[PDB]
Each structure stands twice: as structure tokens, then as C-alpha cells.
Amino acid sequence: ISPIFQGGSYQLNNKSIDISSLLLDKLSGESQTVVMKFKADKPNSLQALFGLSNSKAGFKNNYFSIFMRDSGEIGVEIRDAQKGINYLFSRPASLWGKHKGQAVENTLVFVSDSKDKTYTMYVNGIEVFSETVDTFLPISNINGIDKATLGAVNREGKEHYLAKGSIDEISLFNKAISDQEVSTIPLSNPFQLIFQSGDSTQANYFRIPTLYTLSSGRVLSSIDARYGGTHDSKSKINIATSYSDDNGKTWSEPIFAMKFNDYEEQLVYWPRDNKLKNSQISGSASFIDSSIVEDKKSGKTILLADVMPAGIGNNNANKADSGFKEINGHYYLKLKKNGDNDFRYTVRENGVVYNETTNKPTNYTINDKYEVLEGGKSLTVEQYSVDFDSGSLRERHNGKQVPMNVFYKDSLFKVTPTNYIAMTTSQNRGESWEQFKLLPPFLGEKHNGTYLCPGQGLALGSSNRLIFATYTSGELTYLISDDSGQTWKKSSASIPFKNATAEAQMVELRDGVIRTFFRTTTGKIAYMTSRDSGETWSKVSYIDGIQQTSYGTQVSAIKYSQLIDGKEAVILSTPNSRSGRKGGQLVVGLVNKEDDSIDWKYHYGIDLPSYGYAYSAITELPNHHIGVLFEKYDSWSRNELHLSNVVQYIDLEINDLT
Numbered sequence: 052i053s054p055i056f057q058g059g060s061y062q063l064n065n066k067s068i069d070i071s072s073l074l075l076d077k078l079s080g081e082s083q084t085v086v087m088k089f090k091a092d093k094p095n096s097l098q099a100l101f102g103l104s105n106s107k108a109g110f111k112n113n114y115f116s117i118f119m120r121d122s123g124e125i126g127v128e129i130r131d132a133q134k135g136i137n138y139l140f141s142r143p144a145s146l147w148g149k150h151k152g153q154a155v156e157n158t159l160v161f162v163s164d165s166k167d168k169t170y171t172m173y174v175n176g177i178e179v180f181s182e183t184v185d186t187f188l189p190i191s192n193i194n195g196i197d198k199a200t201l202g203a204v205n206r207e208g209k210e211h212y213l214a215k216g217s218i219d220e221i222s223l224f225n226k227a228i229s230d231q232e233v234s235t236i237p238l239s240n241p242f243q244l245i246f247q248s249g250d251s252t253q254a255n256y257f258r259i260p261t262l263y264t265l266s267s268g269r270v271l272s273s274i275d276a277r278y279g280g281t282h283d284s285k286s287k288i289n290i291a292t293s294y295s296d297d298n299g300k301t302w303s304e305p306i307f308a309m310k311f312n313d314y315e316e317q318l319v320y321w322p323r324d325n326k327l328k329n330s331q332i333s334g335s336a337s338f339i340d341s342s343i344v345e346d347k348k349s350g351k352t353i354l355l356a357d358v359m360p361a362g363i364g365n366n367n368a369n370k371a372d373s374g375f376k377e378i379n380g381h382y383y384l385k386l387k388k389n390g391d392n393d394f395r396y397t398v399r400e401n402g403v404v405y406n407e408t409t410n411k412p413t414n415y416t417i418n419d420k421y422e423v424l425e426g427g428k429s430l431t432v433e434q435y436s437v438d439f440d441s442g443s444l445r446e447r448h449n450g451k452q453v454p455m456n457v458f459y460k461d462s463l464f465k466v467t468p469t470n471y472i473a474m475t476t477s478q479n480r481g482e483s484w485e486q487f488k489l490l491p492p493f494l495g496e497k498h499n500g501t502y503l504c505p506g507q508g509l510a511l512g513s514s515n516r517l518i519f520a521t522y523t524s525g526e527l528t529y530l531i532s533d534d535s536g537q538t539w540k541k542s543s544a545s546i547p548f549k550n551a552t553a554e555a556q557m558v559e560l561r562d563g564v565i566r567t568f569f570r571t572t573t574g575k576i577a578y579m580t581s582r583d584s585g586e587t588w589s590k591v592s593y594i595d596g597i598q599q600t601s602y603g604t605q606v607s608a609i610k611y612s613q614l615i616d617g618k619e620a621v622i623l624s625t626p627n628s629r630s631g632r633k634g635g636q637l638v639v640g641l642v643n644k645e646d647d648s649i650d651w652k653y654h655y656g657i658d659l660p661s662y663g664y665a666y667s668a669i670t671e672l673p674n675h676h677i678g679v680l681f682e683k684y685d686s687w688s689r690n691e692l693h694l695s696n697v698v699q700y701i702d703l704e705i706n707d708l709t
């Protein structure tokens with residue numbers, strides 16, 4: 052089908068453009084598609100890009116509009132007072148503003164389908180909403196429509212929602228074009244997706260990106276594949292990985308590094324309305340917050356993540372219990388059997404389940420996958436699925452049997468309801484991952500596990516030392532291994548906050564000198580330095596010139612391999628904002644060789660100050676470009692929960708930064 056109207060290069064400079072004569076009498080039938088390529092790098096707070104309205108006195112509420120906000124939100128209104136219909140559909144964080152100093156051409160496709168009674172919006176190749184209604188209102192069947200407008204809506208003769216931006220191309224069709232047809236429309240995206248809705252994970256949501264450049268040149272990424280909306284644990288979340296062998300140009304279909312199967316991997320559209328949006332999968336085990344390092348010694352890749360038993364997250368984890376029992380200098384995983392009121396069991400060497408009241412082995416063992424065996428025979432549990440068919444969240448058995456795991460709700464033997472850290476390794480650079488092992492507790496029997504800092508671990512350049520930053524109340528707790536992650540020791544570093552989410556990332560400034568940058572509750576990013584490969588740590592200082600919110604956001608950090616302005620360089624990625632998670636920046640600092648202080652010299656705005664930027668991952672690609680995988684939305688805001696395909700990847704060169 053050919054367009055019934057096509058036009059382009061319209062400048063919207065706070066003055067609408069009337070295209071009624073060109074468009075109105077071409078509109079026919081009850082189904083329409085609008086295709087629009089547009090730029091808006093300095094949008095007004097709220098502005099219409101396109102409008103069809105009744106401009107007459109008395110009919111102010113009779114119009115169709117496609118509108119955007121300076122927050123990045125896109126949406127439509129479809130309104131007809133006579134019909135008693137006022138439809139508004141939208142999604143936050145759907146737009147790009149600028150990339151590498153140039154306004155981004157967004158590609159918008161809106162489909163109004165009378166046959167299916169469905170309105171669907173795509174932006175930059177991503178479906179941001181699809182809504183079916185009982186009473187369909189065709190966009191050009193609004194009573195008394197007499198104006199077609201760009202850059203405003205004509206209401207009662209006056210310009211409402213005046214726009215600043217440009218419409219490079221606009222086309223309309225008297226048909227609802229298929230999803231297939233939509234896929235053929237060319238895009239001008241400044242970004243790519245590594246993980247995405249409908250991929251191999253079957254998670255509709257993702258959070259907590261990581262990136263790490265391996266010695267082979269392979270670039271590896273990990274992520275929370277989150278099934279029950281974007282909620283932190285408790286939920287169902289797996290850890291997924293993908294890699295690129297061509298400097299980030301293309302990426303492998305994701306596989307899992309850590310997964311549980313007590314609940315089905317379901318691609319679910321999580322409700323965003325105020326009544327149901329806090330619906331949360333409450334009986335599933337999960338993993339959350341991963342971190343990657345490569346070991347030069349063995350060549351193995353190592354990935355850690357937090358582990359949460361069924362129904363457990365940070366909010367309800369038992370804080371006074373590691374989940375392990377100390378018996379003769381060694382730590383053993385505690386287990387509670389169905390029916391008991393105490394944890395009367397432990398898991399000893401070779402997975403033998405021991406009875407603590409009788410100090411005798413049982414006929415039960417735990418295999419490498421933390422699954423329960425009786426007499427060497429695999430026990431099973433029935434898997435759960437979730438649905439909203441009854442109007443609220445339901446979690447129910449689905450008929451399928453899966454191996455019984457001690458992290459599950461339905462297991463005969465269950466671990467302590469608290470948080471743990473696990474580790475897995477890969478011997479083929481992310482092509483497959485081993486079964487995960489639990490790390491031991493580092494701060495005693497009666498202290499819950501520390502929390503992994505998402506992102507990268509640190510491999511020291513001049514030794515075989517590996518360090519993973521973690522945090523808990525009152526300190527950073529660095530985990531240190533000198534034997535390829537076979538054994539770990541802690542190095543504690545006090546910080547001046549209680550109960551902070553002190554997400555920390557490290558860079559090696561020079562041989563044995565580690566600077567750690569971390570999130571606080573002060574509105575400023577902090578740092579500390581070690582000069583002995585992580586054995587001891589300095590007092591805490593703070594970075595000026597960057598602002599965060601009171602609650603803070605993860606900061607990612609790397610040491611760049613090449614000199615910049617003749618100096619060693621570190622690069623930080625963070626939102627720069629005191630208001631919310633937005634205003635994403637890369638900040639380039641040069642190291643003063645005389646005292647290791649850093650002059651934060653260059654700031655690169657990832658996109659508009661008002662557009663979303665939350666958790667982030669950066670890595671120096673093998674060709675010396677910079678890869679950034681980041682949450683392009685406000686992942687703190689309760690208005691921006693459960694958005695799909697907002698974790699995005701871009702490629703930058705150093706010259707773009709400076």
C-alpha cells in the first residue's frame with residue numbers, strides 16, 4: 052500500500068504547520084497508520100508532533116494527537132466528547148534526543164486498527180504499547196474534525212502543545228499495516244539491543260548490565276533477565292550472557308549463566324497501572340546483580356551474582372544469619388526439612404546431607420546443581436507459572452516436573468531464607484557456564500552475606516590477583532583470590548554510612564594501586580584508594596563536579612589503555628543529576644602522576660539532561676572504542692517500572708568524548 056499523504060522537512064519552531072488541505076480529504080476508512088521520522092533535541096515540556104482536531108468552539112475535547120514529553124515519553128490521545136471517549140495511551144522513556152552531538156532521527160510508527168480494535172505504537176523499532184479496546188475510535192472519525200496539524204493541536208482556534216523540533220518525514224496510510232510490514236521500515240537508530248524482549252531468555256525485562264573485554268578480544272556481557280516486571284528480588288530473575296567477537300557490532304543469542312527452574316521462563320506483559328504495578332512474583336527463587344572478571348592464570352572467565360531463595364529479596368532476607376554453620380573451622384550450608392521448626396541439617400563434603408541432632412549422614416545428598424537426591428535418585432517438584440487472568444497475580448502449578456532444588460519453595464530440604472553469593476566459571480569465554488557454587492560467609496555465622504557490586508571484578512595487571520567488590524552495612528567488603536577463584540578472602544574497608552547501597556567499581560591506576568568509585572547517600576560519588584593490591588584501604592573522599600540523587604545510582608568505571616592529552620585516563624559512567632536517574636554522562640579524568648589525584652576534564656552527555664540514564668556498564672573495546680550498555684530510563688521512578696527494551700548499547704570513540 053502506498054501512502055495517502057507524504058511530506059517532509061518540516062521545522063517546528065513553536066509554530067504549528069497546517070496541512071489540512073493536503074491531508075484531511077485523503078483520510079478514509081476506519082484504520083490508519085502514521086509513520087513519522089522526527090528530531091527533538093530541545094523539546095518543550097509537553098508537545099504534540101501531530102494532531103487531527105475539531106478546531107471549533109465547544110469541541111475542545113475532540114482530537115487525536117501524537118505527543119511527547121521532555122522526559123522522553125511518547126503517547127497518543129484519542130478524544131470525542133459526543134462519543135464519550137477519552138483515550139490516552141503512552142510509555143515513558145521511548146525516545147532518543149542526541150547522540151555524538153547530533154539530533155537523533157526517531158522513527159515512529161503508530162497503527163490504528165479498527166478490525167482488531169487495537170492501537171499500537173512503535174518507536175525506533177521497539178513496540179512501546181499495544182492496547183485493545185471495547186469501543187474502537189477511528190482517529191479520523193472524531194466528530195467534526197476540520198484541522199490536520201504538525202507541531203500543535205488546534206483547539207478552539209488556538210495552538211495547544213506547541214512543539215519545538217523537526218519532522219523530517221511523515222506518511223499516512225489508510226490501512227493498519229502488519230507487524231511484518233512494520234519490521235521492514237528502515238530505522239536510523241543510534242543504539243543496538245544485546246538483550247531484548249522475545250529473545251532466548253524469554254524475559255520481557257532486563258536490568259543491571261555488565262560489560263567486560265576478554266583477552267581474546269571477545270567482549271562479554273551479563274544481565275539480570277527479569278521475568279516479573281523490572282522488580283528486584285523477590286521475583287524470578289536469571290543471569291544471562293551474550294558476547295561479541297566483532298568489537299560490539301553483533302552479539303550472540305543469549306544463554307544463561309545462572310538459572311532456576313522452579314518457575315517457568317514466561318514472557319509476560321507486566322501491568323503498569325497503579326493498582327497492579329507492584330504485583331511481584333513471590334514464590335520464586337532468583338539471582339540478581341552479576342559481576343564478571345577474567346583470570347589470566349587459568350584463562351577461565353568468572354561470574355558472580357547474588358542468590359535469593361524462593362520468595363526472598365533484600366527486603367525480607369534474614370539479616371542475622373549467614374545460612375551456614377561453623378563446625379571445626381569450616382562452614383556448612385544449613386537445611387530445614389519439611390515439617391521441622393529448625394534447621395537440623397547441614398550439607399557436608401560430597402553433598403552428603405547430615406542430621407545435626409544425631410550427627411549422622413542421611414540417605415539424602417545434594418548434587419552439583421544444588422538438587423536433592425534420595426538414594427542417588429533425583430527428587431522433583433512441580434513447576435509454577437504466573438498469570439493475571441483473574442485480574443490479579445496468581446502463581447500456580449503448571450503440570451511440569453523439574454529437579455528438586457534446595458533453593459525452591461516446594462523442596463523437601465530448604466536453605467535459610469537469606470541472601471548468598473554464588474560463582475560460576477566458563478572455559479570457552481561465555482559459550483557455556485558451569486554449575487554455580489556458593490561462596491562461604493566472610494563476616495561470620497550470624498551475619499547475612501554481603502551484596503555483590505554489579506559490573507566488573509578487577510584482575511590485577513602485575514599478578515594473578517582477582518578482586519570482586521561487595522558491600523554491606525558500614526563497609527565495602529572486597530573479595531580477593533590469588534588462585535583462580537578457588538579460595539577467597541575478605542578485605543574490609545569502612546565507609547561513613549550505615550545501610551547504604553554502596554555499589555562500587557574499581558580501576559587499577561598503576562601497578563598495585565586500585566581506586567574504587569562508589570555510590571553513596573550524600574549526592575556525591577565517593578572513592579577510596581589501595582596501594583597494596585587491595586590489602587589495605589584509604590579514607591573516603593568525594594568527587595566534585597558530578598551530582599547524584601540522595602539515594603544514588605551505580606557508577607561504572609574503567610582505566611583507558613591509551614594516553615589522553617599525554618596523561619593516563621580513567622572514564623566514569625553515571626547519571627549527572629540531583630533530581631532523578633537522568634542526564635547520563637561519560638566523565639573523562641586524567642591522572643596526576645605526582646599524587647594520583649584525578650582532574651575530571653571532559654564530560655560527554657550520553658543524551659539529553661532530562662532523558663533517562665540509570666545503571667550502566669562500560670568497557671574499552673579491543674579497537675579502543677568505548678562500549679556502553681545502560682539502562683536508558685529512570686529505574687528508580689515508580690512511573691517507569693516494567694518497560695521493555697530500554698537497556699541499550701552504543702559505540703563511542705574517545706574523540707566523541709573530548
Ligand SMILES: O=S(=O)(O)[C@]1(CNC2CCCCC2)C[C@@H](O)[C@@H](O)C1
Nearest residue numbers: 262263264510609612670671672673
Ligand atoms: O585491563 S583489563 O582489566 O584486563 C580490561 C581489558 N583491557 C583491554 C586492553 C586494551 C584493549 C581493550 C581493553 C579492562 C577492564 O575494563 C575489562 O574490560 C578488562
